[PDB]
Amino acid sequence: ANEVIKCKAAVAWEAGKPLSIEEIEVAPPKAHEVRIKIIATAVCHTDAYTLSGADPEGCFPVILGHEGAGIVESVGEGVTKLKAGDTVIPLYIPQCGECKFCLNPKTNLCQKIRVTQGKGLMPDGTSRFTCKGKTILHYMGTSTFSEYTVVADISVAKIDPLAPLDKVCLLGCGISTGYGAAVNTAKLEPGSVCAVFGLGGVGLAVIMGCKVAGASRIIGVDINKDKFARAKEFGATECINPQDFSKPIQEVLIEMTDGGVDYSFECIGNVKVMRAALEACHKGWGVSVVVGVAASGEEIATRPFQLVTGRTWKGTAFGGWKSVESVPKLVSEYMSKKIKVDEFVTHNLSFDEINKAFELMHSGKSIRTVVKI
Amino acid sequence: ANEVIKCKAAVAWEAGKPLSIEEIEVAPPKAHEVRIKIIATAVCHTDAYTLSGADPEGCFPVILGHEGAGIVESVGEGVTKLKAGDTVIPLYIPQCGECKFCLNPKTNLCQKIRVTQGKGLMPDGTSRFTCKGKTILHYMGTSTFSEYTVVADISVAKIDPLAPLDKVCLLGCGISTGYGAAVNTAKLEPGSVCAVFGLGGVGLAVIMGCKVAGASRIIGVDINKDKFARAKEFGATECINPQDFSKPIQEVLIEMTDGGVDYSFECIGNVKVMRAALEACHKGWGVSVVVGVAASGEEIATRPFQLVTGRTWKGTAFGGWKSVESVPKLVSEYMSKKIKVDEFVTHNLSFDEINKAFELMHSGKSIRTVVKI
Ligand SMILES: NC(=O)c1ccc[n+]([C@@H]2O[C@H](COP(=O)([O-])OP(=O)(O)OC[C@H]3O[C@@H](n4cnc5c(N)ncnc54)[C@H](O)[C@@H]3O)[C@@H](O)[C@H]2O)c1
Ligand SMILES: NC(=O)c1ccc[n+]([C@@H]2O[C@H](COP(=O)([O-])OP(=O)(O)OC[C@H]3O[C@@H](n4cnc5c(N)ncnc54)[C@H](O)[C@@H]3O)[C@@H](O)[C@H]2O)c1
Ligand SMILES: CCCCCCCCCCCC(=O)O
Ligand SMILES: CCCCCCCCCCCC(=O)O
Ligand SMILES: [K+]
Ligand SMILES: [K+]
Ligand SMILES: [Zn+2]
Ligand SMILES: [Zn+2]
Ligand SMILES: [Zn+2]
Ligand SMILES: [Zn+2]
After folding, report:
1. Is A53 in the same domain as A134?
2. Which parts form a coiled-coil structure per UniProt (chains A, B)?
3. CB–CB of B299 and A294 under 8 A?
4. CATH of the domain at A80
């Protein structure tokens, strides 16, 4: 029988405060739920955004984390596709395969459990986390900052049992998104001229995707020149710092590409840079893809003339990958050396030092920090 | 030998005043130029905007008009594809077929003569119009408000001699644009749910295109309910007036379609409605195409969230048709009865009554007025 598990977890008691390593209780999985033992997890800007209290959708107390990889500890009633021991990756974008969205080839945004997930609850409307007598909320349907988490069965990707979990946990978000933005959303053709704004883990994954697709030019853009070396290693043909120019970055890109790039990607979350990314696109056929998540309230803008004269403005969520069916394949692409993963890991920490990952992220000195549970 | 031609034309001496029927001189065609005898010309809000004086690029004196059909009166040196007698349609969007744009399948925006055309001049930098001792400027590279006009040899579509010129003159603008917006820019699939904002000639052509593509639902939107009857005749499954609802129009549409439309088309030129059109699109795969030409300086806006969650913002110019090769085919589709043209004509006038065409536009009681030269 599946019992209540007593384990450690990094709890976010309140907005604006660091995470606290607490002893918590994890209820057994109910019908169509899966309990997972998290082996490794990474931290992303989104976890920090929610933690800051700036996220109008954020609620506390809560167990954050959405970039993890683990092993199935037990499954609830009705679950047959998964079993104890399976190697998996929690998914914040599920795939029920039955809804209006899963049935449509043009999207990956399953809506089956979005309502409850937004409230930090399981599909049945309750939470499996408790701590010191209080209910602790789930986050993005994953809550990877715990030794053991419980997710909806449609929020799980079964992967290659040989994949090193302290590496593939990154496919839970950043890598997959940037890579998918290039090959799924933009679908850039061989020989394309591209520009990538923001050279963090996401931008690097975009560059990686542009190289896989055979781009002829990949121009990285970042105000932090320390990001350049790794950008080139990933495939950037050149990097520029908007701070070195006196004219708008879009004019610079237009100037160095004889009209503008074929595809641009904003991987920062700056509405002003998003406009520049669109305007840096070549007249007639340029396509700009928004990947960054802007603070709530912020709006993007430009003159309709930009679209009338040929440019297209797109966006992407988790690289457009239908999660459950795609993630296993991304793991296989990693195992076969088609895509990189290890190269995104810049720092490693133990669970007790989880807050240092947030510090490294804000010091701007890391791409991705993997936390060993 | 080609001599100077004295003829009648509707001259716009200054902004904010009615066109003046004058006698003018039309120089012969220089190298790579074609002089055309205009048989019929229509009028649309773009001609009126320039005349209003609100166009930051409107210069006077000028001979307006960009919707025409006629016969080649004579050609200049080096012109061998066209000859006197050919039936043709002048094009404000040329097709040199040799520039980077004409060679790229994703666009129809030939740039070979845009600079001079924008200055109301032929490619050689001069004008062929004179009147009362004053040089008169060309307009949109067509100047169809004259018995005779001269245009670049790459601004000409050779069409079926049997086509009725007082009809196909509308294919030089509105009809082609709306139709193309649906089948070239949107490329909507059979069964698509569509919304068309603005039911003028452009919107009706979009509806016509949606029907040809096999759209399942076509919702027409306009603040003037008198535009509804004809919209339904063209294929709209229903029409709604934004004024009849207290909620923003995009909220009404989302409600009416269980999520939003698959494709929306803005055929007005109102940035606020352009935003509504985008937000009225369905999450995950919705696509909005801006067809309307907004006033200078105005800009469109929305929250990047809209793009990140699946929507796409596009625009179109002359329906994306590579002008020289497409117009003849569009004429053929009309001849074959695949598309409508005659149904767009709401009024007919003689050349001397040309100003009345503008009066009809202001009263909002016309789609297209055809002026017989
Ligand atoms: N759409 C999605 O599904 C999805 C998925 C994951 C992440 N994201 C978003 O992607 C964005 C990037 O994630 P990340 O982990 O790579 O973040 P990151 O902070 O590590 O990288 C962002 C980079 O932007 C650079 N930058 C900041 N201002 C700049 C400017 N004005 N011009 C050029 N560069 C500038 C920074 O130096 C940094 O290197 C974030 O907004 C994240 O929330 C979106
Ligand atoms: N992109 C192109 O290549 C291209 C080509 C031709 C025309 N255009 C532009 O297309 C637009 C329309 O051309 P047209 O000939 O059909 O003009 P039109 O005036 O005949 O049509 C405009 C319609 O929009 C309706 N309308 C006005 N405000 C509205 C609102 N708030 N909500 C709903 N409907 C509203 C008007 O009542 C009218 O029925 C103009 O901007 C024109 O310049 C663009
Ligand atoms: C770590 C980055 C995660 C941010 C995810 C961005 C994806 C937005 C889609 C969520 C909205 C929806 O599913 O209806
Ligand atoms: C009849 C009015 C239509 C006016 C056309 C609007 C399209 C503007 C695009 C300009 C073309 C270019 O810059 O190459
Ligand atoms: K593509
Ligand atoms: K399409
Ligand atoms: Zn992340
Ligand atoms: Zn689903
Ligand atoms: Zn017109
Ligand atoms: Zn050209």
Report:
1. yes
2. none
3. no
4. 3.90.180.10
